[PDB]
Write a protein that binds this ligand. Structure first.
Ligand SMILES: Nc1ncnc2c1ncn2[C@@H]1O[C@H](COP(=O)(O)OP(=O)(O)O)[C@@H](O)[C@H]1O
Ligand SMILES: Nc1ncnc2c1ncn2[C@@H]1O[C@H](COP(=O)(O)OP(=O)(O)O)[C@@H](O)[C@H]1O
Ligand SMILES: Nc1ncnc2c1ncn2[C@@H]1O[C@H](COP(=O)(O)OP(=O)(O)O)[C@@H](O)[C@H]1O
Lengths: 96, 48, 96, 477, 96, 192, 841
C-alpha cells in the first residue's frame, strides 16, 4: 500500500498537468518547446496504453520500473512551465 | 663553477642553485639526455 | 516639504521638463549613479531624496562627486534628514 | 536471492552488453585469450568466481559482440569453443550504386538548407552527379594506394561521411549570385584536398594524386576549373558576419570558416604573435609560405568539436610553437605534463584527472599536448589510445568518487534532455570538450610499432605529414 | 507585509492602473522602510499622470496605460504604545 | 639626535600646542634652552627650494615635510586640501613614479608592477588601511637564493630594492585600527 | 480534517511563502499549501488549521485579511485565495503579552485558570494506569501524604527553573511507579519533589518529610544521602567506594577518566537509574553550575546501558534546526512505512540525542528561540515539517539535554511550555572534603607510576596533604577574584584536573635520590604558576597572588622552599633520555619536559634561529629575559595534544615572530590565510577544508594562525568557536563528500579499536592534531564583545597576558644597541617613554 499510494498520488498530477498542457503547445507550436513536450507525450501515452491492456489496480505495483518514469515526466513538466513564464506574462499584459 | 656527478644525491638542488646564481655548470657522468633537462636545453622563458 | 518649491522653480527657470529626480531605496542606487553621470553630461538638474536611510552608500556618492566633470547650469539638489553617523566630506562640500 | 548473490538490470528487463571488438584482445604465448575464456565461462555457466572467495551468478544479460574479418595484423583468430556456442553472420561493403544514393540523399539537404530556390543547384541530377564524382575519386584513390606502403593509408566511407558533414562550416550563402559553379567547386576541392592529400608521403605520389583529382574534375566538366586558388586560406579568422574570445560551448559544426588572403592572414598572425609575446617568451618567428599553410591546417582542425592531431615530421621544425600560438589565439588552455626525476604512472593519472575534471565539468575548451620525451613508461600510449577512441579512461576513477563530482550535473542533465545515468553525459562532454596533440618524430625507431600497435591512433586523429621544407623556401630564409 | 520587492509593488500598481480598481492597501504601515521610499516615487508618478489627464504613464520602463476611473487608498494605525513592530512612514510620502 | 628622533617617531600626529609643550619640556629636560631643530636638521637653501614648488610656508607644513625624511616606516598623509600631496608628487619627479586612486579598476595589477619594477608609489584616495597591504607594510621577505619575495594575495612577487610607498588621505577620520597604526606613522596637514 | 502548523520553529519564508529574488518565481509555503488543500474540498467538509505555537505580531498580523469581516488570503505576488463558510483557525497559546489589540479584537477567545484545575482528577487516571499489584498501598499513601508535600513546596517557591502546577505534579509522580513499602515510598516522594529546589530548602524539606513520617534515619547528619535497599530494608548509610584499578593506561584518553564513586555521584546515579531504563522513556535535563561534573556522569550512565547509540551535539548561539537534522541523519535509517516516511535508529534500539547546552541559543527581539520551539514541536507531536512540502515523523528518539544555572550573561531563560513537559533536577558543587578525596586518589597513582617504593613519597597521608593544599589554593584564589574584573577569570575544577594530569610530562624519576622534597615541590609550584598566574592582568594582583602562593607553601611546611628557581625553564629542548623531527603521531601527554638553564636555552634558540633564517627572512631578534619567558611558555603549551592559545597583548611586540620560530623548531606546519581584495566566506571555507583534510587525514601536527586583520566578516569567530569547542565545523561538508574521503580510514579504524562510524574517528584525529593561534590586540574596542560572545574562546585555549615589558628590560635594550655618560642617556630614554605613554606608546 505504501508503494501504491505514491504511484496513484503521482499519476493524478501527471494526468491533470498533461490535460492542461496539451492544447497550448498544440495551437502555438514553437519547436524548442515541441520536442520537450513530445517526449513527455510519448512517455505518458506509452504507460496509458499498458493500462488500457490490463486494468487491474495492482499491476502498477508490478510494471517495469515506473517510478523513475513518473518522476522524470513530472520534472520535465516543471521545466516546460519555466519555459512558459514568458507567454504567461504576455497574456497577463493582454487582459488586465 | 660547480661540477656535479650524474648519479648524485643532490642533483636537482644543486641544479636549482646553478640556474639561480648564474653559475657555469659541468656535469660528469651523463648516460644520455635526462628527462628533466629538456626546457632548459631548449628556450622556455616565461616573463615576470 | 521642499519638493513643490523645487518643482515650481524648475518650471520657472527651465522649460521642456529638464527636471529629473530619484528617491533612495532598495534597488535604486546603481541607477542613481548612472542618472548622476548622464545628467552631469546633459547639464540638466538632479534631485536626490532621503539620504539619511542609505548611510552606507554615501562614500560612493562623494567619490563620484569628486570625480565628475560637470557642465554649466547643472545643479544638484539633495534632501536629507537629521541623522547621527553621517559622513563629513559631502557636508564640507555643500551648502546647508 | 537463494543459491548465491546475483546481478539484475535496474529499471529494465533485458540489459545488453555491446562488445565492440573481439579480434583485438591479446593472446598469451600459447594462443588463449583470458577475455574470450571469461566470456565462454559466462555464456556457458551464467556465472563467475568473483574474488573474496564466492561464486556470483548473473541473471538477465545478453552479449552481442562485433568484429572485423581477420585480415590485417593485430587481428587474432577465435577459438572454436567460443565460435560454435553463439550465432554469427557477415555483411558486405555498400557498393557504388548504393553509395551514390546515400550521398546524393545526404548532399541534397545539407546544400539545400540554403540557396534552395536558385538556378543550377536544385534539380538534383547535379546533386547526384557530384556524389558520383566523389565516389569515383574515393574508388580510384583506393585503387592506387594500399596499407603495404605505410601504417596509415586508411580508407573507409567514414572519410566520405566526415567529408560531406564538413560542409556545414562554409559560407555557401549565394545571395550574391556568383557564376556560381566555381565558388562551390573550389570549396569542395579544398575540403577534399585537406582531407585526402595531407597524409601522402612521397612527392611523386602527391603529383599522381593531383593528376587524379584534376582528371576527375575535367572529365566531369570540361577543363580548367581548379586553376588558381592555391593562395586561398579558409581560416576561422574572417568570414561572413564577423567570426572574429567568449562563447565557451562549441557550435555543433565548429566555428564557421571564410575566405581570406595571404598578407591579411600575415597581419592577423602578427597581431596575435605580438599579443602572445606580451605574456610569454618573445618569439622571433619568420614567415614563408609553408608556415602559413601549417597554421591554416592546424586552425581548420582545432576548430572542430572533438579534434586531435598526429604531427609526424622531422625534429627541429616548429610544431609546438605554432600550436601554442593557435591555442592562445583561440583562447583554449594548453596543457603539457612537466616531467621530473621521479616519473611514475600515478603522476600521469593525477594529471589526467586534472584535465578530465576541467574539460568535463567546467565546459572549457582544452588542448592537451604530449610529445616524445614525456612517454617515459610504456602504458601511456595505451591510455591515450583509449581516451581517444572511447571517451573514458578505464580503471581511472573509483565508484565512490563519481557521485560527489558528477552531482552538479543532474540539473543540466535534466534540462538538456539527455537520459540514462550521469556518467554518459560526463563522457559526452569530454568527447566534445578535449583536444589531444601528439608530436612524434618521423625517423625514430619505435614509430612503426607505435603506429601499428594502437589502431585508433590513426583512426581518430587527422595525421598531417609535416616532413621537409621546400627547396624554394630554404633559399628565401 | 514582509517587505516585498518594489518591482512586486510595481506590477500590482500596473494592474490597478490598467483595470481601474481601488487598491485598499490595508496595513501600509508595516512595510520595509526603503520600499516605502521607492513606492513614493511610484505613487507620485501615477498621481501626476492622473492630475494632468494623461492616458499613457511610464514606470518600470514600459508605457503602461493608466485608467481615468482609477484610485489608491491606504489604511493604517499610528505606531502607538502597543501596536507591535511598525516603522514610521516618510515625510515625503505623507505629503502625497 | 634624541630630540630629532623623538619628534619624528612620536609627534607627527598631535596638535601644535602639544608640539610646543613637549618640545619645551624635553628641551628643559636636556638643559639647552636654545638650540632649535628645524635649523639643526635642514638648512635655508632646501627650505626655499621646497617653497619654490608649492609647499605651504607655515611652521606646521615645514615640520611635516621634515618628518617624511623617515623611511623606517610608511608615511601617512592626513591632508584635507591637496597642496602637500601636489608638492610631494612634484619634487618626486626625478625617480620612477606612478600615482593611482583607491577605488580604481586596475589597482592590484599596477600594484604588482610597482612592486616588481621598483617604482616609487603614491596612492590617492585611501579610506583607511587596506587588507591587502599588510605584509608589504610589514617585513615579509622569503628568500629565493639571492633575492626576496613578498606575498600579495595569491601571487609570489619579487621585492625590488627600490620600493618606496606613500599614500594620501582626504579625511582625518576614517580609518586606523590600533593594529595598523603601530607600523604606519601618521602626518596631519592642518590649518592653524 | 486537521492541519497542524507550529509557526516559530520553521523560518518565515517557508511558513508564509516567499519569492525567489532573481528568478521572479513563487515558492509555495506550508499554510498556503494547506489553504489550497482545504479550498479543494467539497461543501460537506470542515477543517481546523491549528497553529500550536507562540505569538509574534509580525506574522500573526499577516492573517488580518483572513480573520477579517472579509474572508481572503493574499499572496505577495497578487494571488488571492478566498475561504468559504467552513474553515476555522484554532490558536493554542501561552499568553498574549506581545500581541497588538487589532488581533485581540479580531478573534474569539477562551480563558483558563489555575483554579479550575483538579489535581486529584489527574492523580486518579495515573493510578488507573497501574498494573494492579501495588495499587492498594499506593492509593493509601497518596491520599494522605501527597497534598501536604505539594502545598509545602508551593509555599516555599525557591525552585530554580520555573514550572507550572502540572509540571510540579508530574515531577512528583514520575519517580514512583513500582514502590513496594512505606519507607521506600517516602524516599521516592523526596526524589520526585525536592530535585527542583536548592540546598537552602532541600534540607528542611527532608527534615519535615522524615519528621512528619514515621521515624528518622541514621542519616541525621546530611540527610540528602539515604540509600534504601530492597535486600535488607536498610534506610541510610553513605559509603565511599574506592577503586583499585589504577595505571596510566586509564588516563590515555583525555575523556573516559576514572570516576571516583563519591556519595554525591551515587546520589546522581540513583536519580538517573529510574529514568534511563527501557520501561520509562523519559526526557530529562540536569542543572548544574558550570564545570561541575555533568557530562562525565551522564556518559557513565550512557555506558551502563544495553543497546543504545549516543550522539552528542554541542549547541551554541548559532545552532539551528538543520544542524541537529544532519547530526541525526548521519546515523539513522530512512524506512517508508504507512502514514508518511519516518526515521529509525540503525543497528540499535534507543538512540539518544545528547544536547549539550540549552540556555545558550539566541532569542529574537520578542523572546522565543526557534531551537526550543522546534524541540517543543518534536517532544509534543513526534514529527516535523521537513522541506519540499512533506511531513516526516520520527520513531525512537530520546532527548536528554543539559544546561547551566542562568547566572551569567548569554544565558537566556527558558519558556514554561518547554519546561513543564519534560523532567529535571539539579546538583551541587563537589565540596572540599570530597575534592580532597578525589584528587588524593588521583595524586597517588600518577605519582606512584614511579618511585613507588621510596622514602617520603608513599604512606599517602602526604599525598592527601598535597591535594588538600592545592584545594586550599584553589579556594582562596576563587575567594580573591571574580568575573566582574574581566571576561576570563574562569575557575572550575577542570583546571585542577588539567593541572594534576599535567604531571605526566615531567621526569619525576627519583633514582638519583634527592632531598627529595624540593625537586618535586618546585615542579608542582612551577606548574601551578604557569596555570593560574599567567592570566592575571594587574601587577598588584600578581603580587597578592605571590603572597597567597608563598603563604600556602609556608603554612604547609616551615618557610623558604620556593626561594630561587626563577631562572628555571622547563622546556622540551632537553630532558632525560634526550628529548632533542620525526615521530608525527603525538604522545598521550605530549613530549616530556626537563630542566635547563638560561644561557643554554639561548644557544638552542640561536641554533634554531640560524636554521630559520636560512630559508626565511633573516631575523634581527634580540634577547632579554622576557623573550626567554615567552618562548618557554609557548613551547610548554604547543607541545600538548590539542593545545591552542589566545595571545592578548599590545601591538608591536613580537608574537607571530616567536610562534613562527617555535613552529619551525617543532617541525609543525604553520598556516595563515592570506587575504586579498575579494574576501568572502567561501574562501575561508576552502582554506578550512584544506587544513582539516591535512590535519585529520595525514596525521600531521599542524599550527593554524589567525590574527586581527583577517577577521573580515563577522562569522569567522563563530566558526573558530565551534572548531575549538567540538572538533567539527557544522554545515561544512555535505553527505556525499565524506565517504570517498573517509574511506581510507576504516582500516586503522578497524585496527585501533575505535568503534562507531568513521566520522567520530575523523573528529578525534582533528581534536588530537590541530593547534589554533589567535593574536588579538588588547585595547581594540571589540575585544570585550569578542571575549564575551564566544565562551569557549576562553574555556578551550590558555590565555597568556603578554601586555607590557618591564622597566628593567627597556633600559637594557639600548645597551645591546650600544656595542651592536652612559647611564644618563639610558635613564633619559625610560623617562621620555614613560612620559609618552599617555598618548599611545
Ligand atoms: N618558421 C620559423 N621561423 C623562425 N624560427 C623557427 C621557425 N620554426 C622553428 N623555429 C625555431 O624553432 C624553435 C622551436 O622548435 P620546436 O617547435 O621546439 O621544435 P619541435 O616542434 O620539433 O619540438 C624556436 O626557437 C624557433 O626559433
Ligand atoms: N566526582 C568527580 N571526580 C573526579 N573528577 C570530577 C568529578 N566531578 C567533576 N570532575 C571534573 O570536572 C569536569 C566536569 O566537566 P563537565 O562539568 O562535564 O563540563 P561541562 O560543564 O562543560 O559539561 C570533569 O572533566 C572532571 O574532570
Ligand atoms: N624581542 C625582540 N627583539 C628584536 N626585535 C623584535 C623583538 N620583538 C619584536 N621585534 C620586531 O617586531 C617585528 C615583528 O612584529 P610582529 O611580531 O609582527 O608584531 P605582532 O606580533 O604584534 O604582529 C620584527 O620586525 C622585529 O624586528
Amino acid at each position: 500500500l505504501a508503494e501504491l499510494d505514491e504511484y496513484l498520488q503521482n499519476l493524478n498530477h501527471i494526468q491533470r498537468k498533461w490535460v492542461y498542457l496539451e492544447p497550448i503547445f498544440g495551437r502555438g507550436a514553437l519547436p524548442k518547446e515541441q520536442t520537450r513536450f513530445n517526449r513527455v507525450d510519448e512517455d505518458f501515452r506509452s504507460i496509458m496504453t499498458d493500462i488500457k491492456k490490463d486494468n487491474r489496480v495492482t499491476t502498477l505495483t508490478t510494471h517495469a520500473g515506473i517510478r523513475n518514469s513518473l518522476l522524470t515526466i513530472l520534472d520535465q513538466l516543471q521545466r516546460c512551465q519555466r519555459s512558459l513564464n514568458e507567454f504567461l506574462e504576455e497574456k497577463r499584459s493582454a487582459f488586465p | 663553477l660547480e661540477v656535479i656527478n650524474q648519479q648524485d644525491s643532490n642533483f636537482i638542488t644543486a641544479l636549482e642553485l646553478a640556474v639561480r646564481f648564474g653559475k657555469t655548470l659541468i656535469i660528469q657522468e651523463m648516460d644520455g639526455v635526462e628527462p628533466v633537462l629538456y626546457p632548459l636545453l631548449r628556450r622556455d622563458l616565461v616573463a615576470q | 516639504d521642499p519638493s513643490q518649491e523645487l518643482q515650481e522653480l524648475a518650471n520657472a527657470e527651465r522649460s521642456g521638463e529638464c527636471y529629473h529626480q530619484v528617491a533612495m531605496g532598495q534597488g535604486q542606487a546603481d541607477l542613481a549613479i548612472q542618472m548622476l553621470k548622464e545628467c552631469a553630461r546633459n547639464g540638466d538638474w538632479l534631485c536626490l531624496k532621503n539620504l539619511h536611510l542609505v548611510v552606507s552608500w554615501l562614500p560612493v556618492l562623494e567619490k563620484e562627486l569628486n570625480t565628475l566633470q560637470p557642465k554649466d547650469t547643472f545643479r544638484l539638489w539633495l534632501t536629507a534628514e537629521v541623522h547621527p553617523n553621517f559622513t563629513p566630506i559631502l557636508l564640507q562640500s555643500s551648502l546647508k | 536471492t537463494n543459491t548465491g548473490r546475483v546481478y539484475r538490470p535496474k529499471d529494465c528487463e533485458r540489459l545488453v552488453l555491446y562488445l565492440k571488438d573481439i579480434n583485438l584482445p591479446k593472446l598469451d604465448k600459447w594462443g588463449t585469450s583470458t577475455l574470450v575464456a571469461f566470456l565462454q565461462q559466462v555464456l556457458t555457466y551464467q556465472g563467475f568466481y568473483d574474488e573474496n572467495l564466492e561464486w556470483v551468478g548473473l541473471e538477465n544479460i545478453q552479449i552481442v559482440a562485433s568484429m572485423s574479418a581477420g585480415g590485417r595484423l593485430g587481428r587474432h583468430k577465435l577459438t572454436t569453443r567460443f565460435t560454435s556456442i553463439v550465432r554469427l553472420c557477415s555483411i558486405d561493403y555498400p557498393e557504388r550504386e548504393q553509395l551514390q544514393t546515400i550521398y546524393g540523399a545526404y548532399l541534397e539537404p545539407v546544400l539545400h538548407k540554403n540557396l534552395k530556390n536558385h538556378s543550377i543547384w536544385g534539380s538534383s541530377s547535379k546533386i547526384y552527379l557530384l556524389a558520383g564524382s566523389m565516389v569515383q575519386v574515393y574508388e580510384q584513390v583506393r585503387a592506387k594506394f594500399t596499407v603495404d606502403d605505410y601504417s596509415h593509408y586508411f580508407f573507409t566511407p567514414c572519410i566520405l561521411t566526415q567529408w560531406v558533414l564538413g560542409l556545414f562550416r562554409y559560407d555557401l550563402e549565394g545571395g550574391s549570385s556568383n557564376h556560381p559553379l566555381d565558388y562551390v567547386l573550389e570549396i569542395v576541392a579544398y575540403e577534399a584536398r585537406r582531407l585526402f592529400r595531407d597524409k601522402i608521403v612521397g612527392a611523386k605520389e602527391l603529383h599522381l594524386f593531383d593528376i587524379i583529382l584534376t582528371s576527375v574534375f575535367q572529365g566531369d566538366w570540361g577543363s580548367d576549373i581548379l586553376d588558381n586558388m592555391s593562395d586561398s586560406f579558409y581560416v576561422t579568422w574572417g568570414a561572413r558576419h564577423n567570426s572574429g574570445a567568449p562563447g565557451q560551448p562549441l557550435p555543433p559544426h565548429g566555428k564557421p570558416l571564410g575566405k581570406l588572403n595571404s598578407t591579411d592572414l600575415k597581419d592577423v598572425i602578427k597581431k596575435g604573435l605580438i599579443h602572445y609575446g606580451r605574456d610569454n617568451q618573445n618569439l622571433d618567428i619568420l614567415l614563408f609560405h609553408e608556415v602559413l599553410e601549417y597554421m591554416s591546417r592546424i586552425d581548420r582542425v582545432l576548430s572542430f568539436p572533438g579534434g586531435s592531431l598526429l604531427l609526424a615530421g622531422r625534429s627541429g621544425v616548429g610544431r609546438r610553437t605554432i600550436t601554442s600560438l593557435v591555442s592562445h589565439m583561440h583562447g583554449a588552455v594548453l596543457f603539457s605534463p612537466k616531467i621530473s626525476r621521479g616519473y611514475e604512472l600515478k603522476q600521469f593519472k593525477n594529471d589526467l584527472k586534472h584535465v578530465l575534471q576541467l574539460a568535463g565539468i567546467e565546459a572549457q575548451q582544452v588542448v592537451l599536448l604530449l610529445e616524445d620525451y614525456q612517454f617515459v613508461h610504456p602504458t601511456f600510449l595505451e591510455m591515450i589510445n583509449s581516451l581517444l577512441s572511447s571517451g573514458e579512461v578505464p580503471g581511472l576513477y573509483t565508484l565512490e568518487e563519481l557521485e560527489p563530482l558528477l552531482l552538479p550535473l543532474k540539473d543540466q542533465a535534466s534540462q538538456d534532455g539527455f537520459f540514462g545515468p550521469v556518467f554518459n553525459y560526463f563522457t559526452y562532454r569530454i568527447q566534445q570538450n578535449l583536444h589531444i596533440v601528439l608530436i612524434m618524430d618521423s625517423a625514430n625507431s619505435n614509430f612503426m610499432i607505435n603506429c601499428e600497435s594502437n589502431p585508433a591512433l590513426h583512426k581518430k586523429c587527422q595525421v598531417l605529414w609535416m616532413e621537409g621544407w621546400s627547396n624554394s623556401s630554404m633559399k628565401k630564409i | 507585509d514582509e517587505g516585498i520587492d518594489v518591482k512586486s509593488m510595481g506590477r500590482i500598481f500596473v494592474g490597478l492602473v490598467k483595470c481601474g480598481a481601488w487598491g485598499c492597501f490595508d496595513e501600509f504601515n508595516r512595510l520595509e522602510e526603503s520600499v516605502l521610499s521607492a513606492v513614493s516615487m511610484q505613487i507620485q508618478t501615477i498621481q501626476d499622470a492622473l492630475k494632468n489627464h494623461r492616458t499613457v504613464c511610464e514606470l518600470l520602463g514600459k508605457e503602461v496605460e493608466v485608467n481615468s476611473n482609477s484610485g489608491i487608498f491606504i489604511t493604517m494605525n499610528p505606531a502607538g504604545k502597543g501596536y507591535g513592530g511598525r516603522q514610521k512612514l516618510p515625510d515625503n510620502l505623507k505629503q502625497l | 639626535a634624541q630630540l630629532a628622533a623623538a619628534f619624528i617617531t612620536y609627534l607627527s600626529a598631535a596638535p601644535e600646542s602639544l608640539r610646543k609643550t613637549c618640545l619645551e619640556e624635553w628641551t628643559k629636560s636636556a638643559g639647552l634652552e636654545k638650540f632649535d631643530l628645524r635649523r639643526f636638521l635642514c638648512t635655508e637653501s632646501e627650505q626655499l627650494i621646497w617653497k619654490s614648488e608649492g609647499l605651504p610656508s607655515d611652521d606646521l607644513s615645514i615640520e611635516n615635510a621634515l618628518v617624511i625624511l623617515q623611511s623606517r616606516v610608511c608615511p601617512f598623509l592626513i591632508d584635507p586640501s591637496s597642496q602637500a600631496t601636489e608638492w610631494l608628487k612634484t619634487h618626486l619627479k626625478d625617480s620612477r613614479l606612478e600615482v593611482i586612486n583607491q577605488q580604481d579598476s586596475n589597482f592590484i595589477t599596477a600594484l604588482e608592477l610597482a612592486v616588481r619594477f621598483g617604482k616609487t608609489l603614491i596612492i590617492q584616495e585611501m579610506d583607511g588601511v587596506e587588507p591587502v597591504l599588510y605584509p608589504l607594510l610589514r617585513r615579509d621577505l622569503v628568500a629565493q637564493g639571492p633575492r626576496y619575495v613578498v606575498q600579495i594575495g595569491d601571487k609570489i612577487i619579487d621585492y625590488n630594492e627600490e620600493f618606496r610607498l606613500f599614500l594620501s588621505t582626504r579625511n582625518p577620520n576614517p580609518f586606523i585600527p590600533p593594529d595598523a597604526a603601530s607600523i604606519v606613522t601618521e602626518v596631519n596637514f592642518t590649518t592653524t | 480534517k486537521q492541519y497542524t502548523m507550529n509557526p516559530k520553529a520553521m523560518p518565515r519564508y517557508q511558513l508564509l511563502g516567499h519569492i525567489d529574488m532573481d528568478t521572479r518565481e513563487w515558492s509555495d509555503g506550508v499554510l498556503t499549501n494547506s489553504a489550497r488543500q482545504v479550498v479543494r474540498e467539497p461543501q460537506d467538509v470542515s477543517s481546523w488549521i491549528i497553529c500550536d505555537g507562540d505569538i509574534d505580531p509580525e506574522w500573526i498580523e499577516s492573517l488580518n485579511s483572513v480573520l477579517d469581516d472579509n474572508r481572503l488570503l493574499t499572496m505577495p505576488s497578487g494571488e488571492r485565495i478566498q475561504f468559504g463558510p467552513n474553515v476555522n483557525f484554532v490558536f493554542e497559546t501561552h499568553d498574549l503579552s506581545c500581541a497588538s489589540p487589532a488581533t485581540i479584537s479580531r478573534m474569539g477567545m477562551i480563558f483558563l485558570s489555575d483554579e479550575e484545575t483538579d489535581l486529584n482528577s489527574l492523580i486518579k487516571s495515573w493510578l488507573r494506569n497501574q498494573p494492579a499489584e501495588y495499587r492498594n498501598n499506593l492509593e493509601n499513601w497518596i491520599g494522605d501524604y501527597f497534598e501536604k508535600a505539594l502545598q509545602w513546596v508551593l509555599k516555599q517557591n525557591d525552585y530554580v527553573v520555573e514550572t507550572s502546577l502540572v509540571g510540579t505534579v508530574m515531577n512528583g509522580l514520575s519517580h514512583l511507579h513500582g514502590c513496594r513499602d512505606h519507607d521506600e515510598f517516602i524516599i521516592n516522594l523526596i526524589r520526585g519533589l525536592g530535585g527542583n529546589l536548592n540546598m537552602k530548602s532541600r534540607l528542611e524539606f527532608t527534615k519535615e518529610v522524615f519528621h512528619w513520617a514515621r521515624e528518622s534515619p541514621p542519616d541525621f547528619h546530611k540527610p540528602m544521602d539515604t540509600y534504601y535497599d530492597s535486600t535488607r530494608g536498610r534506610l541510610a548509610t553513605y559509603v565511599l567506594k574506592k577503586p583499585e584499578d589504577l595505571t596510566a593506561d586509564d588516563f590515555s584518553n583525555g575523556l573516559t577518566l576514572p570516576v571516583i564513586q563519591t556519595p554525591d555521584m551515587q546520589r546522581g546515579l540513583d536519580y538517573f537509574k529510574p529514568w534511563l531504563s527501557s520501561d520509562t522513556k523519559q526526557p530529562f535535563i540536569l542543572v548544574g553550575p558550570e564545570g561541575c561534573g555533568k557530562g562525565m556522569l551522564l556518559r557513565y550512565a550512557f555506558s551502563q546501558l544495553r543497546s543504545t547509540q549516543i550522539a552528542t551535539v554541542h549547541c551554541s548561539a548559532q545552532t539551528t534546526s538543520r544542524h541537529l537534522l544532519q547530526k541525526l541523519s548521519q546515523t539513522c535509517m530512512v524506512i517508508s512505512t504507512n502514514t508518511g516516511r519516518v526515521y529509525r535508529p540503525k543497528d540499535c534500539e534507543r538512540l539518544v540525542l545528547y544536547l549539550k547546552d540549552i540556555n545558550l541559543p539566541k532569542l529574537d527581539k520578542w523572546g522565543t528561540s526557534t531551537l526550543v520551539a522546534f524541540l517543543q514541536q518534536v517532544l509534543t507531536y513526534q514529527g516535523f515539517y521537513d522541506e519540499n512540502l512533506e511531513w516526516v515523523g520520527l520513531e525512537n528518539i530520546q532527548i536528554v539535554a543539559s544546561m547551566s544555572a542562568g547566572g551569567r550573561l548569554g544565558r537566556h531563560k527558558l519558556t514554561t511550555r518547554f519546561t513543564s513537559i519534560v523532567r529535571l533536577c539539579s546538583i551541587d558543587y563537589p565540596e572540599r572534603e570530597q575534592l580532597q578525596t578525589i584528587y588524593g586518589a588521583y595524586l597517588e597513582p600518577v605519582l606512584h607510576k614511579n618511585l613507588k617504593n621510596h622514602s617520603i613519597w608513599g604512606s599517602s597521608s602526604k599525598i592527601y596533604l598535597l591535594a588538600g593544599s592545592m584545594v586550599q589554593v584553589y579556594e582562596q584564589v576563587r575567594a580573591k577574584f571574580t568575573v566582574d574584573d574581566y571576561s576570563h577569570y574562569f575557575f572550575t575544577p577542570c583546571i585542577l584536573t588539567q593541572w594534576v594530569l599535567g604531571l605526566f610530562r615531567y621526569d619525576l624519576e627519583g633514582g638519583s635520590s634527592n632531598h627529595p622534597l624540593d625537586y618535586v615541590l618546585e615542579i608542582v609550584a612551577y606548574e601551578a604558576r604557569r596555570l593560574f598566574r599567567d592570566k592575571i592582568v594587574g601587577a598588584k594582583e600578581l603580587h597578592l597572588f605571590d603572597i597567597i602562593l608563598t603563604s600556602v607553601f609556608q603554612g604547609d611546611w616551615g618557610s623558604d622552599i620556593l626561594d630561587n628557581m626563577s631562572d628555571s625553564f622547563y622546556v622540551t629542548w632537553g630532558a632525560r633520555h634526550n628529548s632533542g623531527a620525526p615521530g608525527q603521531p603525538l604522545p598521550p601527554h605530549g613530549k616530556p619536559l626537563g630542566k635547563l638553564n638560561s644561557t643554554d636555552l639561548k644557544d638552542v634558540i640561536k641554533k634554531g634561529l640560524i636554521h630559520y633564517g636560512r630559508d626565511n627572512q633573516n631575523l634581527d631578534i634580540l634577547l632579554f629575559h622576557e623573550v626567554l619567558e615567552y618562548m618557554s611558555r609557548i613551547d610548554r603549551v604547543l607541545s600538548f595534544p590539542g593545545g591552542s592559545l589566545l595571545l592578548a597583548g599590545r601591538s608591536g611586540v613580537g608574537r607571530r615572530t616567536i610562534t613562527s620560530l617555535v613552529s619551525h623548531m617543532h617541525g609543525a606546519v604553520l598556516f595563515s590565510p592570506k587575504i586579498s581584495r575579494g574576501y568572502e566566506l567561501k574562501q575561508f571555507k576552502n582554506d578550512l577544508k584544506h587544513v582539516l583534510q591535512l590535519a585529520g587525514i595525514e596525521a600531521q601536527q599542524v599550527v593554524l594562525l589567525l590574527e586581527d586583520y583577517q577577521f573580515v566578516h563577522p562569522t569567522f569567530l563563530e566558526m573558530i568557536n565551534s572548531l575549538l569547542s567540538s572538533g567539527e565545523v557544522p554545515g561544512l561538508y555535505t553527505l556525499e563528500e565524506l565517504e570517498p574521503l573517509l574511506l581510507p580510514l576504516k582500516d586503522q579504524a578497524s585496527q585501533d579499536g575505535f568503534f562507531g562510524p568513521v566520522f567520530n574517528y575523523f573528529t578525534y584525529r582533528i581534536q588530537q592534531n590541530l593547534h589554533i593561534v589567535l593574536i588579538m590586540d588588547s585595547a581594540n574596542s571589540n575585544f570585550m564583545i569578542n571575549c564575551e560572545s564566544n565562551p569557549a574562546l576562553h574555556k578551550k585555549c590558555q590565555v597568556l597576558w603578554m601586555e607590557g615589558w618591564s622597566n628593567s628590560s627597556m633600559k637594557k635594550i639600548p645597551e645591546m644597541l650600544f656595542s651592536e655618560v652612559d647611564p644618563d642617556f639610558l635613564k633619559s630614554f625610560l623617562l621620555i617613554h614613560e612620559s609618552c605613554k599617555a598618548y599611545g606608546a
